[PDB]
């Protein structure tokens, strides 16, 4: 299967390939997430963490005659991933809730979400988690959470790169819509912090859903006569205001993504979207991954069924790309913390040995390794200290031209090549 | 409290150049427009232009570009204006004043804050 | 550039009575649902005060018989009553178009 592969240390990868909205239940017990909505990209980076073991794997350098295996799951439902996740830290098939396991560690999750309902149980005995996607701002605590790290940045460094986009330009009234989620109210509540002194006028704001009234918000826009409009959300969200501001007739408008959907590869080529005006984003710089090509070519319990067959590989490798390099370097920066727990060398590994969880830790911690030409490494807080953000614009050909970049150790634009519609 | 904080008069020959500065505390400097404003004795205002801080760029009324330059310095907080080839139609007070919260636009702003006033006296 | 005409140029008030002063401008100053005409005193040898924006809105601190109405091209600001440290010069702005351009000031003068 896909979701298992057989190995000397296992490591957790925790992915939601595909999604359903939230409803109720009456039975304890997990939801057939293979039945629901297949999300591509997402897919892709679940692909993307299989890539980077199979790849240590191949190498003799790193971890050298010590295999890497894992268990993967596709969690459409944060509150039903418990199954999963019970799965990873049991002892044999068991949990015992008073002892200071499967897993040595554990890859994701993608939301804020996933990762505020499961992590104090990670935490309590500090079995660590690299999130490659979980940007809450909560979560550069340590302690709160003194196991958790992450190869994205948190929001307030996003925001940051928002407003300097809105600085730039001549606007000053500003819409933020947001997920109604903790990815959402932490982004409104950074933006809130970042803007309360300076020129920048919050003028209007809303949580918001596939359900939301669409035709409300953005009536309640225009009448504040409102330009600018920054939609802080998740791909499902995203697609759902932008989507709805094509058929509402919203014309004239100066979108602004976060890197959750600057690179979507749906909208840009959807029918009418030159119409609601600019889209300009805060977007992740597309990283290659030498050899991620080949291996899709080769690769085309609950929660560990894709039911994807029929698929094609220019789709999924055409796919939004974004987060590809923090799955990539979340599953080395573990592999190498591994590789340096156990003390092995260039030729070999001590076996046998025996790794607790938080041995892992101290080790994750100091990470200090290239990767791509890249240096991966971590703050206090568990935060990345690497990446960068490009900022970018939608052409009239249905791409994300890079028009400039934001760095976080200090933000430059292109006016020109932005085109106005 | 928000403070902008001008340097003392200047007397200066015709011909030469000369900088004013303007010290910004209480607030975040690179969040609001920086503007100047020239009053001449039996009193107009008139607006020269602004600078946006974070940034750098600018923007002047027509006559003042290639007369005027703003700069600002974030290190220390300080907007600069520096005016080039004095002549005694250059005699005036000038004024720095920050742009105030609640314009749709940096060109709509409002002038909420202001600094005491430069004299400049163009003399030999 | 948009020019504004203030009216009258000087006026005396007596204490306790109302004061009306108005700006007409070239052109609209209207946009984004707003007026941007402002309202600046100014004291001699001091810099200038904001007193109103946005046509009608009184700024923090103001005093609250100062109040300013009008839209498109007429504003008025009103002084209601007028007291003893009221004698300025008054001067209206416009900042709907770039550059922003000021009246050329009515002199309150408190008439006894």
């Known amino acids: 299967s896909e979701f298992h592969l057989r190995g000397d240390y296992l490591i957790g990868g925790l992915f939601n390939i595909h999604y359903v909205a939230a409803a109720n239940f009456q039975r304890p017990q997990a939801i057939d997430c293979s039945s629901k909505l297949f999300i591509l990209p997402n897919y892709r980076r679940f692909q993307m963490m299989r890539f980077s073991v199979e790849e240590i794997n191949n190498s003799s350098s790193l971890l050298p005659n010590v295999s890497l295996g894992y268990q993967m799951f596709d969690h459409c439902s944060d509150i039903h991933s418990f199954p999963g996740i019970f799965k990873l830290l049991s002892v044999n098939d068991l949990i015992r809730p008073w002892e200071d396991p499967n897993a040595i560690g554990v890859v994701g999750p993608f939301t804020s979400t996933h990762a505020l309902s499961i992590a104090p149980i990670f935490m309590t005995n500090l079995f660590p988690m690299v999130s490659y996607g979980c940007s809450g701002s909560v979560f550069s605590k340590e302690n709160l959470y003194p196991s958790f790290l992450r190869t994205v940045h948190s929001n307030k460094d996003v925001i940051n790169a928002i407003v300097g986009i809105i600085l730039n330009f001549n606007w000053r009234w500003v819409a933020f819509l947001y997920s109604d989620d903790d990815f959402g109210k932490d982004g409104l509540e950074q933006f809130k912090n970042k803007i309360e002194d300076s020129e920048i006028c919050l003028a209007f704001y809303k949580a918001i859903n596939v359900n939301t009234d669409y035709l409300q918000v953005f009536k309640q826009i225009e009448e504040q006569n409102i330009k600018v409009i920054v939609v802080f959300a998740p791909k499902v969200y995203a697609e759902a205001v932008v989507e709805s501001a094509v058929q509402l007739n919203v014309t004239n408008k100066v979108w602004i993504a976060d890197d959750g959907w600057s690179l979507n590869k749906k909208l840009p080529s959807m029918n009418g979207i030159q119409n609601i005006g600019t889209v300009l984003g805060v977007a992740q710089p597309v990283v290659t991954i030498p050899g991620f090509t080949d291996f899709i070519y080769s690769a085309i319990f609950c929660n560990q069924k894709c039911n994807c067959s029929n698929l094609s590989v220019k789709s999924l490798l055409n796919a939004d790309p974004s987060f590809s390099f923090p799955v990539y370097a979340a599953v080395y920066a573990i592999a190498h913390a591994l590789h340096n727990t156990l003390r092995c060398g260039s030729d070999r590994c001590p076996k046998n040995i025996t790794v607790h969880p938080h041995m892992i830790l101290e080790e994750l911690k100091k990470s200090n390794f290239t990767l791509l030409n890249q240096t991966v490494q971590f703050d206090e807080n568990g935060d990345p200290k690497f990446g960068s953000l490009s900022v970018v614009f939608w052409n009239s050909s249905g791409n994300a031209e890079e028009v400039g970049s934001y760095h976080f150790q200090s933000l430059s634009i292109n006016k020109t090549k932005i085109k106005w519609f | 409290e928000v403070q902008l904080q001008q340097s003392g008069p200047e007397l200066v020959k015709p011909g030469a150049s000369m900088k004013i500065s303007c010290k910004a505390s209480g607030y975040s400097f690179t969040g609001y427009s920086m503007n100047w404003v020239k009053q001449s004795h039996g009193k107009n205002l008139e607006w020269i232009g602004l600078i946006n801080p974070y940034n750098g760029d600018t923007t002047y009324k027509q006559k003042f570009k290639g007369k005027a330059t703003l700069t600002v310095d974030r290190s220390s907080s300080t907007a600069y204006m520096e005016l080039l080839r004095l002549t005694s139609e250059d005699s005036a007070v000038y004024y720095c004043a920050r742009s105030g919260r609640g314009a749709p636009t940096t060109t709509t702003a409002w002038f909420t804050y202001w600094g005491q006033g430069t004299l400049v006296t163009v003399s030999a | 550039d948009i020019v504004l005409t203030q009216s009258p140029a000087s006026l005396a008030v007596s204490l306790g009575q109302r004061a009306t002063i108005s700006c007409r401008a070239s052109?609209?100053?209207?946009?984004?649902?707003?007026?941007?005409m402002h309202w600046y005193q100014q004291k001699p040898g001091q810099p200038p005060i904001l007193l109103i924006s946005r046509a009608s809105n009184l700024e923090s601190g103001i005093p609250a018989r100062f109040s300013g109405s009008g839209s498109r091209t007429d504003f008025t600001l009103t002084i209601n009553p007028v007291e003893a440290d009221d004698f300025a010069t008054y001067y209206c702005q416009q900042t709907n178009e770039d550059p922003r351009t000021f009246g050329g000031g009515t002199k309150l003068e408190i008439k006894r």
């Open positions: 052109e609209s100053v209207d946009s984004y649902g707003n007026s941007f």
